[PDB]
Amino acid sequence: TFNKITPNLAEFAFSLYRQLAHQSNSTNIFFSPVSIATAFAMLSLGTKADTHDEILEGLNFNLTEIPEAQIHEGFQELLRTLNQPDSQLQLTTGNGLFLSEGLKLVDKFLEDVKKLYHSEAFTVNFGDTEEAKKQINDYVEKGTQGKIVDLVKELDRDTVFALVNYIFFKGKWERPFEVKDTEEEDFHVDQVTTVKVPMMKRLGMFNIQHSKKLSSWVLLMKYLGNATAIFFLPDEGKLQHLENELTHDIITKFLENEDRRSASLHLPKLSITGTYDLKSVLGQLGITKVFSNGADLSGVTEEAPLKLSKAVHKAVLTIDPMSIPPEVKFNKPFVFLMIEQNTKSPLFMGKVVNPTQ
Ligand SMILES: CCC[C@@H](NC(=O)c1cccc2c1CC(=O)N2)[C@@H](O)c1cccc(F)c1C
């Protein structure tokens, strides 16, 4: 069916998406609800009281309704699915915890992080800010075989604790077809901005429909690693309407539909990245205490004060009847979700507005 925590991850995806889209309506959006929520659920194991409750509530878990055991069990099961060989061929995810080597660390936290969340904790010398930044970036670069470079650009001089969360997905259509060369085609960013994109033209039976509720074309395509992308192409002037009207229930209904129709598609071959300061973005969702001097991280270190000084997310996606069917060109801004098929968990959510930006 679906993972217990999938509805929570869906609400977290919409909360974070709508925050980013409200900030700027001219900006690309690309993040992993799954990888950010996993990292902060893992971090919550080392926190207590208001610091702890703020993190899980900020991930859209109602702690009056869902027991904390079912939350961690949900994530462990989700990670079990994501760590299967078929998934691992397309999907790399990692969480690096970097802690000042002068700290006495609680063994229980280091056990739970490594055991339950398959995450890595390192001691680093934050006395040397430039070397610590290099060590963090080397760990991410090595984890992604050179794909993610110089992830952390700045560390505060008083940094004692940094968290880096990364996800790398190699996108390749599951279904083989009559492969042509891409052709360079216009992508209408806005009324006065056009950029060339490589466009794959396909005529076939697609899981595609027009939605009166979303005022959008809705296309579902399958990728290796048990992933389904839902692409929402809004009608002229309806992108904000589409963003406003999306719900988990609506997305579930699209994922359940297997009906196809004949369509001529123009599909841009787009690689996309998103980099986020999680202290900034999660702060706006109400996660603030863990990043403040007040932070209760007594689960990480018993003796000394501790706060999370730095939290960075990076998401990377790379691509490896005889009657006139509809012609649908993804040649203008579109919204998307990528779902993991077993759990129905939102691996990615975002919006392409400028393919070159
Ligand atoms: C509207 C389609 C965008 C999509 N394109 C393709 O998947 C594509 C296009 C041409 C050739 C080709 C592919 C896959 C393959 O194997 N060959 C992709 O760029 C994308 C954008 C944002 C989010 C996201 F999840 C994904 C998958």
Author numbering: 22 to 341, 357 to 393
Q: Please, what does the article write about this entry?
A:
Ninety‐five per cent of severe deficiency results from the “Z” allele (Glu342Lys) that perturbs the folding of α1‐antitrypsin resulting in the secretion of only 15% of the mature protein. It perturbs the local environment, allowing population of an unstable intermediate that we have termed M* in which β‐sheet A opens and the upper part of helix F unwinds. Polymerisation from this state involves insertion of the RCL into β‐sheet A with a domain‐swap of the C‐terminal region providing the inter‐subunit linkage.
The structure reveals that interaction with the compound induces the formation of a cryptic binding site that is not evident in apo structures, at the top of β‐sheet A behind strand 5. This region is referred to as the “breach” as it is the point at which the reactive centre loop first inserts during protease inhibition, and includes the site of the Z (Glu342Lys) mutation. The structure reveals that the 2‐oxindole ring of GSK716 stacks with the side chain of Trp194 whilst the carbonyl group forms a hydrogen bond with the mainchain Trp194. Trp194 adopts a new position due to rearrangement of residues Gly192 to Thr203 consistent with the change in intrinsic tryptophan fluorescence induced by binding. The phenyl ring and the propyl chain occupy two highly hydrophobic pockets. This causes displacement of residues Thr339 to Ser 359 of strand 5A relative to the apoprotein.
